[PDB]
Design an enzyme around this catalytic site. Sequence first.
Site: not given
Ligand SMILES: *C(=O)[C@@H](NC(=O)[C@H](N)c1ccccc1)[C@@H]1N[C@@H](C(=O)O)C(C)(C)S1
Length: 695
Positions: A164, A408
């Site tokens: 500059e 869950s």
């Molecule tokens: C919690 O996420 C739970 N899930 C279910 O109950 C769902 N209704 C379900 C999804 C698929 C198959 C069966 C149920 C329980 N905990 C889940 C997890 O730990 O990922 C599970 C699939 C063991 S059940």
Amino acid sequence: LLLKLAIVFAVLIAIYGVYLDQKIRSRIDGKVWQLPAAVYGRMVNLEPDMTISKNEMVKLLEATQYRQVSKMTRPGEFTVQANSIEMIRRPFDFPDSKEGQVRARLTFDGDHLATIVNMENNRQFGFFRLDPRLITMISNGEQRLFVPRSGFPDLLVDTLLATEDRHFYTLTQQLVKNLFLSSERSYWRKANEAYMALIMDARYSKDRILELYMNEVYLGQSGDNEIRGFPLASLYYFGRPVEELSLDQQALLVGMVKGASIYNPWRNPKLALERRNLVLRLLQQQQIIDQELYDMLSARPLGVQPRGISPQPAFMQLVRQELQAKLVKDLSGVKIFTTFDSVAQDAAEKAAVEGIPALKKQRKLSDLETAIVVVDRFSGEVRAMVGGSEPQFAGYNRAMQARRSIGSLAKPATYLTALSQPKIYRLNTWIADAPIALRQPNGQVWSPQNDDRRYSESGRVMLVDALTRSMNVPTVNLGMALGLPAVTETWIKLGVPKDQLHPVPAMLLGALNLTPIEVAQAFQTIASGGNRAPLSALRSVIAEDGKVLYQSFPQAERAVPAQAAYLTLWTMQQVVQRGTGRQLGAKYPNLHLAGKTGTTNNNVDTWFAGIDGSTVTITWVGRDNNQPTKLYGASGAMSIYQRYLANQTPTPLNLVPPEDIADMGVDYDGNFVCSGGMRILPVWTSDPQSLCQQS
Ligand SMILES: *C(=O)[C@@H](NC(=O)[C@H](N)c1ccccc1)[C@@H]1N[C@@H](C(=O)O)C(C)(C)S1
């Protein structure tokens, strides 16, 4: 003669010079520019016997914008040897104590920091601060970062002067046009500029002219905000302060001053390279630089760019939200200190970027998204936040905006409620596992089933195994006996928004729609040992004059009993070791991680709550359109967490038992025994004489 027109016109422009002097004076002798609020990350202090390895330290230094070198010359640099690291810690205006440069040797003994010594006097440090990384600025439409005269290297001033001006009186002319005048090519502007320049150099020292010029100069554009001055451009273009620029990078920034948009390195890198090279020679004509240096500098790229606008949009949403709640906009030169962990964010961002398309290909998915929330186990301080699969560029933050069914992940609040009653519910307590047909209002039956649609051959399960296995039927039987208002109270204590709680039988299995951040608060409460630490992104906000505008203090409140929190977490380690999250437990067995998996009806949402020695990671993996993911907690969200764990050095969870915790022997029948026992379970008793009552 015409001196009645000559001298009167000389004394006419003179009074205009007084008005011009008053205009230049009023700006400088006050506020020159409105400087945006600087956002800084977490401030790490290192102490001897700290659980941190050499490699972890290299990653920490590299994440703090440090450069690994062979020979240490300038700050923000480090060298790594066999069992130690040497570094020049860059100067930083720390809120506790203003510090400069320091040569330090970090000695390591296995997975821990042995000693930190000052390489000036070989004296051992008790604590050694580590400067915070500048995340972003809070936007006039112009962005600056003020650095005084001393902050600029004498070489950079010489690099600027060579390209500059000579400076013996133009450098002061350019200053006045950017500070007070229009963009016009006009001769009136050139005359107004030259007349202002003569007034500028006279009333202010050459050091001040340089200080103002080096901070005003337009050097780049980041969308709607103008990148101006050498300090901010040094960080925007390379990721280093103005004091740590290498001669080639230094020359490029000095080159852009003539045409920042055309001499830009993102677009047309050749024109930027040609200019840089057209700067290095200009210094070469002068005796300052030697002929030896020119050749290596010309071939080595000036950029060297990061390479990239809106840094950390997800975490910034939380920072802005907390700033309004705690407090600010009127004030300039504000320094905002956050709880942001660059190492954790990198680990999380990489897990999302890599993991999401990896799951999309593995399961033939049209679209898939994520949300990751990392918070401190004990302080609730938010370390990392990712609101998507592409977190570099975002508008919609999944960690804060996306409200989804927890599934869950709702289960520990039922077992925590039960385990807060040591005279009634224990880990060895038998809960019924047989068909449930609860009649909800309208006369419609609610029949919840276990994942496999099976029941225990005995028609019962131990409380420990029911949570371990995430068994729906036993969870319902536990919570219904406990009552919904008690489980709803545990949720209030945990720290979930009250307006989301609807206490219906379905609440026990996941009829609680929360955002990943809210889930973090709940799990933070269990992980801390029962103390609810309100989540925060803010550490402190400091003014330009060093005034403490806002200071963060612990607001931790005892929510659940420690013993109840310990037993939930101990079972949450069983989840990861033998239960639903056994895939993670096998991958990281020495981490003794506590965790819970969540999968919603028709695979809509996948969740994982990951607890290690120091953090709580909440990870959700689902789709914006609410379609099935074909993923489970362990396959989707836990896989992103596995990736997050791998991308860093996680803390092994050493679950230190509180008072009244006693490991007790249990028979096959579930009864306590004095000696032996086929199962060992922690129990909440001051006197483990529950066995004598059982015998
Ligand atoms: C919690 O996420 C739970 N899930 C279910 O109950 C769902 N209704 C379900 C999804 C698929 C198959 C069966 C149920 C329980 N905990 C889940 C997890 O730990 O990922 C599970 C699939 C063991 S059940």
